[PDB]
């Protein structure tokens, strides 16, 4: 037989110097790390959309329980947990008449109509941000269902509304949150059978938790940062995306997501070039782009902190070849240690418990050798008495591709990197945050090919 | 001296707000009493309630919800509270806390309608501020606030039965260990005597092309029937390499690299598995990149092996458990089996709609848990067994690799307790 080691669940730091293992309980019991005066809200949409948003904003103030109160804890209310005044009064409303929506909703060319609808939102957004002396925090774009139904692919710019909307404001740095009318008012919207389209009567508290956490984060506050920290350690995640529009099949685009203790990462954009090999399907960078990306990464780190990092980790989905790695090693200061790790979900090893219908406990690891190991990040947990995923988990394959580092410390680090996802106040996620948002960021940055922007905070992308 | 602040309520429905306010107040500097704070029980609970209500309590808040309006315990505690209220001559000893909108004003109990109710229906934070203002006005002794006591209480009362315990467990994987290997791997001399552009994959004993030579697990003279053009081969031009030393990985020569030889062995094992399960009368399904093999309906009696329900029915469809094969080395020699679910209508002909197949797979697998998957995989492995210990996989006329039918066991030192519900 083969032995399994156990990696304990990490703790995240919260208000009043306390540490918890679940973010929701800590938030409801102690409060967020950094507190604001209040949320100044701005909403653009139809009058009915404004009414729905106002109703929901007043509704989230009341307590709201859930059917299974041991797995999905209750929501006391935004003022109770976050101690911020997110009120339905004193918000800036911009009106979009239904006639304007209809004018562009009936176009045959999907790319064209998507472009016109996006611009019809963006011009109002920028005009409201510029002309007004008011300082709104975030812009809540409430969109009718029909636009989303008719603004998706197969229904020189991408054909998705969310990606285009996030891409075009990358140059203006405007935090926006997109909601459908059917989600904020799921009870009101019904089918021809009389039943709701989206049944949230079972997870209403969890939905409110996620919405509240996203709104608090995107307004400027930090809900939580992990507690047990190694000083001066930065994380880097590479993302490649093949551009479909390009005539040359080898053209590809690269991006680097940089993370610190706080879980509020930065995004660096790379130069589009021939990185994709159509023979074996692996992406690799030329030396110059690698130097540029890494130099920007440590320049940003020095700007944020002031001293060069003690360690650097470059998480990626594929192995690095030699020219890429020596190009990377050209730039790094000699006082810093570089590690390059590969994380992939394609290894089919499933462990079955001999008794009981439940699966393997989350956190157990099988270290194959001092350079490669498995990690069960999506296994069963006892804190909420339910596993995170259905069927049987597939562990992550963590192999130290380049550099010298202890495998156990890497395992603990990658397990810790799973608790920082402000878009969803959930117990954990099966993928590290440095690689969790690869597809979304890649598609968003590919949606516009003329992007020339400085490094930006994460909230402008998600 | 009276410092304890009593909370009365109906259980377990009103546990949420009771826990919230108690924890916040006990982290704010006060001392709070309620039924669910101790989890010790058994020490004459009613006498303890009388003792705390009469002797130690300073203030008394009653959660005037719909359930707690007239419950026997709440009514009894309210009677004792009225008695002690008359004793201490405190008009504001009883504080109602309305926590719902559905309780009409006429419905509330007579003894608490007169007293002023502090609002907790619209927002909990404003209600907490109102309670804090009331306690500043009534001058209740207290010390500095400290949320670490709240943390410790939450950890020791409510994080008690959901911790990690040191318990041994045995887990079953989906990997078959290869027991024995042929003595030697043979490279022949061909491609000047076989026809050019030859697909050796259609041959019976598997083989692969390596530039000039032909790599296979077979003697020189076993391909006469397939290629009569190659009967002129002389048995002295076949280079033979021990397989155990390849497993050790210490081979290094200009002829072959170790990684390339291992890849050739992997391809040979994959092909051999393909034909060996071709011989076992199981239907094949060519997926996007692999081939998965399943059993037709009625191939085995009652569609069950031993006590495992392999082939089943869902609505107007029939679902089959299918397996796919692959090989790997250097953890140690291993064969992987990958599980799949497929669907059909008549029991023999697969559904050609990929989206319908995926949706049915999701729907059927949403109700399958670990024990079901494990038992089905074990049963399907046992079905292919030729002996009671292992099954052979053909390499040639006199060469075989014997693969055990018991997956590798894993031993775990940390476990938990199965939930009651």
Author numbering:
A (entry chain B): 1 to 155, 201 to 507
B (entry chain C): 1 to 421
Tell me, in the authors' exact words, what the paper reports:
Short prokaryotic Argonaute proteins (Agos) are associated with NADase domain-containing proteins (TIR-APAZ or SIR2-APAZ) encoded in the same operon. They confer immunity against mobile genetic elements, such as bacteriophages and plasmids, by inducing NAD+ depletion upon recognition of target nucleic acids. Target DNA binding triggers tetramerization of the TIR-APAZ/Ago complex by a cooperative self-assembly mechanism, while the heterodimeric SIR2-APAZ/Ago complex does not assemble into higher-order oligomers upon target DNA binding. However, the NADase activities of these two systems are unleashed via a similar closed-to-open transition of the catalytic pocket, albeit by different mechanisms.
To investigate the interaction mode between TIR-APAZ and Ago proteins, we first co-purified the binary complex from Maribacter polysiphoniae (termed TIR-APAZ/Ago complex hereinafter, also known as SPARTA)30 and determined its cryo-EM structure in the presence of gRNA. We were able to build the structure of most regions of the TIR-APAZ/Ago complex, with the exception of the C-terminal region (aa 419–452) of TIR-APAZ and residues 161–200 of the Ago protein. Although the majority of the gRNA could not be resolved, two nucleotides (2G–3A), defined as the seed region, could be clearly seen. The RNP complex structure is nearly identical to the apo TIR-APAZ/Ago structure predicted by AlphaFold36, with an RMSD of 0.936 Å, suggesting that gRNA has little impact on the configuration of TIR-APAZ/Ago complex, possibly due to the short pre-organized seed sequence or the lack of PAZ domain, which is absent in short pAgo system. The TIR domains in both apo TIR-APAZ/Ago and RNP complexes are catalytically inactive, but target ssDNA binding could efficiently activate the NADase activity. Therefore, our structures presumably explain why target ssDNA binding initiates the dimerization of Ago proteins. It is intriguing to note that a long loop (aa 314–332) protruding from the PIWI domain in the target-free complex would pose steric barriers to the propagation of the gRNA–DNA duplex at ~13–15 bp positions. In the resting state, the NADase activity of TIR is likely to be self-inhibited partially by the flexible BB-loop.
